[PDB]
Amino acid sequence: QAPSGWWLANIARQGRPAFNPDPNYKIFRNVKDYGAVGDGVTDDTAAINAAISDGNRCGQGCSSQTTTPALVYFPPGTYLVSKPIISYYYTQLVGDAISPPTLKAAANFEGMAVIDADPYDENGNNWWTNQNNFFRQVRNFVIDLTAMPFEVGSGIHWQVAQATSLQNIVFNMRTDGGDDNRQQGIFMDNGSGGLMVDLVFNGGRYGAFFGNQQFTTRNLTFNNCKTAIFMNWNWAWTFQDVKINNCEVGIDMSNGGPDGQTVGSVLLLDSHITNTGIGIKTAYDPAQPHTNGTLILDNVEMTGTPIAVQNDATGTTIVDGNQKIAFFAQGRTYGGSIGGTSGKAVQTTEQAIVKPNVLLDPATGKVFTRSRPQYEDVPVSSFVSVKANGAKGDGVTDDTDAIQAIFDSVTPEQIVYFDHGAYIITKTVRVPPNIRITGEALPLILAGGDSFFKDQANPKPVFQVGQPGERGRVEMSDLIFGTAGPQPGAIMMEWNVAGMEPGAAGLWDVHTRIGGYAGTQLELEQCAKNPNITNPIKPECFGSFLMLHVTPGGSAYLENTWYWVADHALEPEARDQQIDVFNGRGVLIEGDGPVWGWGTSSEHSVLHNYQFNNARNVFLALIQTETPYFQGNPDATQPFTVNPNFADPDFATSCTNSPNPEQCKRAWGVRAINSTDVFIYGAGLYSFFDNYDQECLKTQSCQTNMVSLEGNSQVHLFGLSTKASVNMLTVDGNAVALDADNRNNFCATVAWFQS
Numbered sequence: 001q002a003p004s005g006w007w008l009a010n011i012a013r014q015g016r017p018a019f020n021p022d023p024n025y026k027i028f029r030n031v032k033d034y035g036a037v038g039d040g041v042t043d044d045t046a047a048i049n050a051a052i053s054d055g056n057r058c059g060q061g062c063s064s065q066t067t068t069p070a071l072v073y074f075p076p077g078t079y080l081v082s083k084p085i086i087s088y089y090y091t092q093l094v095g096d097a098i099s100p101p102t103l104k105a106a107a108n109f110e111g112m113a114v115i116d117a118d119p120y121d122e123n124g125n126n127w128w129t130n131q132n133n134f135f136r137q138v139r140n141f142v143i144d145l146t147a148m149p150f151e152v153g154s155g156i157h158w159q160v161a162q163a164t165s166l167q168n169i170v171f172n173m174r175t176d177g178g179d180d181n182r183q184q185g186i187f188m189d190n191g192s193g194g195l196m197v198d199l200v201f202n203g204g205r206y207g208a209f210f211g212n213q214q215f216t217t218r219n220l221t222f223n224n225c226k227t228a229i230f231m232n233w234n235w236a237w238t239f240q241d242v243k244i245n246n247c248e249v250g251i252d253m254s255n256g257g258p259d260g261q262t263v264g265s266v267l268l269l270d271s272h273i274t275n276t277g278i279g280i281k282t283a284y285d286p287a288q289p290h291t292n293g294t295l296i297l298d299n300v301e302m303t304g305t306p307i308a309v310q311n312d313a314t315g316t317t318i319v320d321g322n323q324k325i326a327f328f329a330q331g332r333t334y335g336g337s338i339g340g341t342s343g344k345a346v347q348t349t350e351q352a353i354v355k356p357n358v359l360l361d362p363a364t365g366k367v368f369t370r371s372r373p374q375y376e377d378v379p380v381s382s383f384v385s386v387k388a389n390g391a392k393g394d395g396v397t398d399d400t401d402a403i404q405a406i407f408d409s410v411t412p413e414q415i416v417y418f419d420h421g422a423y424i425i426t427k428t429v430r431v432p433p434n435i436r437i438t439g440e441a442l443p444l445i446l447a448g449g450d451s452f453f454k455d456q457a458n459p460k461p462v463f464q465v466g467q468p469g470e471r472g473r474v475e476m477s478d479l480i481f482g483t484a485g486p487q488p489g490a491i492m493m494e495w496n497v498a499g500m501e502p503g504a505a506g507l508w509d510v511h512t513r514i515g516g517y518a519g520t521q522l523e524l525e526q527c528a529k530n531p532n533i534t535n536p537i538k539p540e541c542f543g544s545f546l547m548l549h550v551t552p553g554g555s556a557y558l559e560n561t562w563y564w565v566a567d568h569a570l571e572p573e574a575r576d577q578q579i580d581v582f583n584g585r586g587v588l589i590e591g592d593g594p595v596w597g598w599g600t601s602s603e604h605s606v607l608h609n610y611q612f613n614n615a616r617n618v619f620l621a622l623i624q625t626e627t628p629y630f631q632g633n634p635d636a637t638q639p640f641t642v643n644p645n646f647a648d649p650d651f652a653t654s655c656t657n658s659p660n661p662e663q664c665k666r667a668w669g670v671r672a673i674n675s676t677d678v679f680i681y682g683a684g685l686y687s688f689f690d691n692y693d694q695e696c697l698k699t700q701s702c703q704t705n706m707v708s709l710e711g712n713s714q715v716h717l718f719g720l721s722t723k724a725s726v727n728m729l730t731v732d733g734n735a736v737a738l739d740a741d742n743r744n745n746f747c748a749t750v751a752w753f754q755s
């Protein structure tokens, strides 16, 4: 087939990783330039894998790396492959967005999967630790297994961590063979997601075989699968806008049986299960001693599906189908008339969860969603390259004025294009309220300098997105924000603009990465941990002040946004060793929004990872946090001074009369102050250490408190999972839900809290 004319195939290639010392390293690889024919009859396996591996990238024997990104582009066509496509560390596999190409498995295909994102060597060891397998894309493909035997075949071995996405993929599999069909679209053994959007699964034994700590996956369609979704294990998983059609089972979450359930929790929102034998198979019963198998249904239709929820241990129909299920919860609930202050295990349908109309799509009544923009219809001439217009991107030159002038000059029908590189910013960049910005394979934008961002007593925004009260369209995609050296006064992004319509103001595949990699000066040599000594809290190891601030009047749509403070060093020489980086605050949301956050994560800040202050109209699904591993050496009262202009938590005061004072002074997972109409559909809020020691895991007591609701907040929490916090949820200083009352298979889990 002809070239599509998609801008990405043609835009001038001027990108280069600033901290790769090879001046000839090529970020962009078109597989046909490596000899792929794309006719569906020539074997293209070698050419595709060569396009990925070229340039001494992070493969076997490489723990991780950030200086060898690649964007591997597949023009329209059909690519016959007979061995796995091995996606090296930090690879974007980008099929043509206008006419997604087919990856066609040969009849005699051999290997784990058509795409393997984490191979196993002959010793059974992964190339990369699954929890460290960050910063990936696979987008715009048809994966066709129908020439393979019905007894074998997997589309993608998707064993990955955060800042990863599958987007716009069709999986075509065989429908014959009965119980002997074993094809599956995704095979996932473990990991720590992550986002998936806009997937279609046709046929196979399993649309997806899933196992992961946590994931957010929305707009998935399953047609004619035996089981659409086999949930092998998890701690939490949020599905939204799932369409299951003519399957035997929709979601199987009964693995392990009633005395060994390995699925922690599942949430299913805004979905439809059609012409399916059993909608959801579960082993949960409210008389069980634990919370494993927690399930939330919210706005799920069950057309032509006679059994909506079945207990497959007893064979008993829990919920009848052929109706709309407004709300269903099984697991433990707190608050309101049902659970109260002590909590109660339930398995019941109940009243609809009414959500503010400003959060909803008016055409569907579902919570509003929008996938990462690829600008299919924008001609290449509308793209304004920052490097063509005076920015150097070399990680040393001050690019502030050039970037500001570009932002001031572009008109709304253009798109600012960040060529790959590292762009040093030394004072506030004012982003206008009508702009579109997209990056070449996660370019770095780094707050640098030696004064402007140095003062935690006088913090300053790095990117100031709109001025207060402005409204328009601001879209950013495929970027990383960080610091060049310590910048403890940097507010990485201050979000003032509001979208003219839902989704018109937002971030997609935009991450904040504080420390840990080449260019930050915050790596193993500077910031290695030392748990045996009282932490000196080196000034050279500070991060930023606050990674994201949605101010009053601001409104944003966030999807696949990882707000990460480095727990360990990422270049291969560091061998994943752990470091101390002191970053004050994660995500702070204020005002009436709305704010949507799909597949966001915020990890390892000192004071809090998410905080809402005087906020309304917040929808997050699902969220994930971690406490920094060095606490409590130092504890959360250091090294950031309490600043009431940000409603900072004051642990010295809040922990004074704590009955668990030894670990009270620890970062909040979620803190809500005077905030209402906040909805959280799925949360994994984890505390894994005390001064790098994990003894506290044995007694689920690495910290005292994890979620705080304060000042008459009204927050709706669904599928709240926490790890090793004595109190899961505290209201006005009073512990409400305790870990010991809600034990799951690893975390503790509350199905439903409403205030």
Ligand SMILES: *[C@@H]1O[C@H](CO)[C@@H](O[C@@H]2O[C@H](CO)[C@@H](O)[C@H](O)[C@H]2NC(C)=O)[C@H](O)[C@H]1NC(C)=O
Pocket: 168, 169, 170, 197, 198, 199, 200, 219, 220
């Ligand atoms: C869910 O994702 C699918 C897969 O990307 C979307 O279907 C595509 O929609 C575009 C635009 O309408 C078409 O050009 C493609 O041909 C579609 N592909 C397939 C395989 O159907 C779908 O629009 C998404 N649904 C929602 C509600 O966002």
Ligand SMILES: *[C@@H]1O[C@H](CO)[C@@H](O[C@@H]2O[C@H](CO)[C@@H](O)[C@H](O)[C@H]2NC(C)=O)[C@H](O)[C@H]1NC(C)=O
Pocket: 257, 258, 259, 260, 261, 262, 288, 289, 290, 291, 292, 744, 745, 746
């Ligand atoms: C919830 O998960 C826990 C953890 O896996 C289950 O407890 C384990 O059950 C297996 C049997 O399948 C035992 O071999 C382990 O020793 C148990 N571990 C612990 C720490 O108790 C528990 O049975 C599950 N609960 C439900 C109701 O399914």
Ligand SMILES: OC[C@H]1O[C@@H](O)[C@H](O)[C@@H](O)[C@@H]1O
Pocket: 131, 132, 192, 564, 567, 568, 603, 626
């Ligand atoms: O292995 C280290 C990784 O462990 C995971 O649990 C965390 O989510 C990551 O932030 C971290 O870098």
Ligand code: NA
Pocket: 688
């Ligand atoms: Na860890």
